[PDB]
Design a binder for this molecule. Structure first.
Ligand SMILES: CNC(=O)c1c(-c2ccc(F)cc2)oc2cc(N3C(=O)OC[C@@H]3c3ccc(B(O)O)c(F)c3)c(C3CC3)cc12
Length: 550
C-alpha cells in the first residue's frame, strides 16, 4: 500500500512565506553569516512529497504478536475518562487554526454558543457515522535551519471542531496509557534532569553496557493501516465510557487510518494511507508503534537485557554486550526485523560503548562539574539549529519562541547560558518586556511563560547545579566554538562581557529581575554569590496535537 497518492494539485501556502533571514539592528550582534540561515516554504513541498511517498510491505511474526499481547494486558489496567466539551475547549491553543465553519480558537476557548453547538454536532456525527472519511488540510511547515537545504516538512490536520472532539475522546488516554504500557521506557514522563539520571543508572545497570540509536526513515510514512488498527485495539483495552469507545473507533476508521488531503485553497491534493502528523494521537501512536516493533526486534536479534527508551519515533536501546563482533551482528538482525516490521533505518545503527557517544533527539549526554567539584551529567546538543532560530526570532516575532523553550530545556548547557540567556534578556531589558508572557513549546505542548519565572522553572527542572556548572568537557566546548565560527557568532569571551552588563542591569531593576540576574548570570562574575533555594509539564508527548496549558 502506498503511503500517499497525489492528484498533482499543489500544496499551497495560507499566507506570505519568507525563506531568507530577516535582518534588523540587533542581528549582527548575534549572527554575521546571514546567508547560512533559511526557512522552509511550500516552494519545496514537491520535493518532500517524493520522499514521503512509498510502498509499505509488512511481515509480522510471533515476537511482534507476543509483545502486542503484553502491551494490551497492561493497557487493560488503564481507566480513562471522557473530557467534557468545556474541558476540551480550554486545552485549545489561543492561536490554533480557525474552523472552516465560521468560528476560531478564541471562540472555542470562550465557549461561544456557535463553537459549542458545532462541536456537539461533530461529536454526534462521530457516534452515528463510523465510515465516512474526515477531511484534512495539508500544509507546508515554515521552519528555520542552517545550511548543510532541507525540503519543508508536511503537516496534516483536521478541522478545529474535530480536534476538540479528539480531546474529548482521547486526551486522558494519550496522557495516561503510554506510561502504563511502556513503564520507564516512555520518555515524555521525565524532566531533562530525571532523564539524564535514568539514562546514567540504566547504563550502569549493565555488566558490559552497549547502546545504539535507531532512526527510522520517514517514520510517519512507514506507519501502515495495520499499525493504526493495532494502536486502536490497544486504546480499546482501556476501561472506557461506551460513548468514548464509539468515538475512538469512529476517529480511527475515519481519520487516523487515512483520508483525503485538501490544500489551503480548498483543492483535493490526494489521499493519505499513513500517520497524520497533525492529530492528537500522533505522539502516543508513534511511541506505541515504535516500542512494539523495537521490542519485538530485540527478541528477534537475541539482544540480552534490553532496555528501550522511546519517545515518538525516536528510539534508543541499551543492553548487555556480547562482544564487539557479536554486537555488530545482532544489530544487523535487529535492523532486518525492524525493516520487516516496515521500519527501515535512514542511517544504519552503530553500537556504542560510551553513553555520551549516543545521539538521540539531536541530544547527547555530557559532563560538567558543580560548585563542589562533583561531576554532574546533563543533556546538550549541537547548538546550530537553536542559534539559527534565535537569529530569526531576533528580527521577527514568531508564534513559537524557540529561544525560550531552548533556554528552559537546555539551561545547564554552556551555549544556552552564555549566548541565549545573555542575548534575549538584553533584548527584553531594552523593550522593558521582562514581565510579558511568551508562548513556547515543551514536548509538543504549548505553554505561556513569563521570562521572569525562568530561575524557578530551571531549579525545578534541572536543580540548583544548573546555575553553577563549570569545567565543561573539551568535546562539548569545541563543538560550540566551531559552531560559533561557522555561523559568524561572536566568541564566548564577548558573551561573557555582555553577560556582565546584562547581569548588572537586571540587579538594578530589583525584585524578580534581580533574581534572574543573580541566578542566571552567576557564571559571568569572578566572585560568585552563594546560590540558595528560591521560594503536568512532563506527563506525555503532544507534538502536532494542538494542546495548550497556562
Ligand atoms: C529516545 N531518546 C530519548 O529519550 C532522549 C535522549 C537520549 C537517549 C539515549 C541516549 F543514549 C542519548 C540521548 O536525549 C533526549 C533529550 C530530550 N530533550 C530533553 O529532555 O531536553 C531537551 C531535549 C529535547 C526536548 C524536546 C524535543 B522535541 O519535542 O523535538 C527534542 F527534540 C529534544 C528528549 C525529549 C523528550 C524529547 C528526549 C531524549
Amino acid at each position: 500500500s502506498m503511503s500517499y497518492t497525489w492528484t498533482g494539485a499543489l500544496i499551497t501556502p495560507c499566507a506570505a512565506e519568507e525563506s531568507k533571514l530577516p535582518i534588523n539592528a540587533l542581528s549582527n550582534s548575534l549572527l554575521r553569516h546571514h546567508n547560512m540561515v533559511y526557512a522552509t516554504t511550500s516552494r519545496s513541498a514537491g520535493q518532500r512529497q517524493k520522499k514521503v511517498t512509498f510502498d509499505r510491505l509488512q511481515v509480522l511474526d510471533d515476537h511482534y504478536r507476543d509483545v502486542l499481547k503484553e502491551m494490551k494486558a497492561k493497557a487493560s489496567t488503564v481507566k480513562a475518562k471522557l473530557l467534557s466539551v468545556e474541558e476540551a475547549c480550554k486545552l485549545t491553543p489561543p492561536h490554533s487554526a480557525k474552523s472552516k465553519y465560521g468560528y476560531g480558537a478564541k471562540d472555542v476557548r470562550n465557549l461561544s454558543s456557535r463553537a459549542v453547538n458545532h462541536i456537539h454536532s461533530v461529536w454526534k456525527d462521530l457516534l452515528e457515522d463510523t465510515v465516512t472519511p474526515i477531511d484534512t488540510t495539508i500544509m507546508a511547515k515554515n521552519e528555520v535551519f542552517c545550511v548543510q537545504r532541507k525540503p519543508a516538512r508536511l503537516i496534516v490536520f483536521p478541522d478545529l471542531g474535530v480536534r476538540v472532539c479528539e480531546k474529548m475522546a482521547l486526551y486522558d488516554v494519550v496522557s495516561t496509557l503510554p506510561q502504563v504500557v511502556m513503564g520507564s521506557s516512555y520518555g515524555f514522563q521525565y524532566s531533562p534532569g530525571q532523564r539524564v539520571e535514568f539514562l546514567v543508572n540504566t547504563w550502569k545497570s549493565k555488566k558490559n553496557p552497549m547502546g545504539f540509536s535507531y532512526d527510522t526513515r520517514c517514520f510517519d510514512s512507514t506507519v501502515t493501516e495495520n499499525d493504526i488498527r493495532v494502536e486502536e485495539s490497544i486504546y480499546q483495552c482501556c476501561d472506557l465510557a461506551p460513548e468514548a469507545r464509539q468515538a475512538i473507533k469512529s476517529l480511527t476508521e475515519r481519520l487516523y487510518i487515512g483520508g483525503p488531503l485538501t490544500n489551503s485553497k480548498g483543492q483535493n491534493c490526494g489521499y493519505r494511507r499513513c500517520r497524520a502528523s497533525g492529530v492528537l494521537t500522533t505522539s502516543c501512536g508513534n511511541t506505541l508503534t515504535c516500542y512494539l516493533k523495537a521490542s519485538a526486534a530485540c527478541r528477534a536479534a537475541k539482544l540480552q537485557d534490553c532496555t528501550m527508551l522511546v519517545n515518538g519515533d525516536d528510539l534508543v536501546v541499551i543492553c548487555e554486550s556480547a562482544g564487539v563482533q557479536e554486537d555488530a551482528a545482532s544489530l544487523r538482525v535487529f535492523t532486518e526485523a525492524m525493516t520487516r516490521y516496515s521500519a527501515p533505518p535512514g542511517d544504519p545503527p552503530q553500537p556504542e560503548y560510551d553513553l555520551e557517544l549516543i545521539t538521540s533527539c539531536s541530544s547527547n549526554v555530557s559532563v560538567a562539574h558543580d560548585a563542589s567539584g562533583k561531576r554532574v551529567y546533563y543533556l546538550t546538543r549541537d547548538p546550530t539549529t537553536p542559534l539559527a532560530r534565535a537569529a530569526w526570532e531576533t528580527a521577527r516575532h514568531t508564534p513559537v519562541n524557540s529561544w525560550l523553550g531552548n533556554i528552559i530545556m537546555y539551561a545547564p548547557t554552556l551555549w544556552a547560558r552564555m549566548i541565549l540567556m545573555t542575548h534575549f534578556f538584553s533584548i527584553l531589558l531594552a523593550q522593558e518586556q521582562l514581565e510579558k508572557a511568551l508562548d513556547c513549546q515543551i514536548y509538543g505542548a504549548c505553554y505561556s511563560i513569563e521570562p521572569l519565572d525562568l530561575p524557578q522553572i530551571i531549579e525545578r527542572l534541572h536543580g540548583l547545579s544548573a546555575f553553577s556548572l563549570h569545567s565543561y568537557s573539551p568535546g562539548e566546548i569545541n563543538r560550540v566554538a566551531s559552531c560559533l565560527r561557522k555561523l559568524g557568532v561572536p566568541p564566548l569571551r564577548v558573551w561573557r562581557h555582555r553577560a556582565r552588563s546584562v547581569r548588572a542591569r537586571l540587579l538594578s531593576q530589583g525584585g524578580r529581575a534581580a533574581t534572574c540576574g543573580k541566578y542566571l548570570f552567576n557564571w559571568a562574575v569572578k566572585t560568585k554569590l552563594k546560590l540558595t533555594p528560591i521560594p503536568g509539564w512532563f506527563v506525555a508527548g503532544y507534538s502536532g496535537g494542538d494542546i495548550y496549558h497556562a
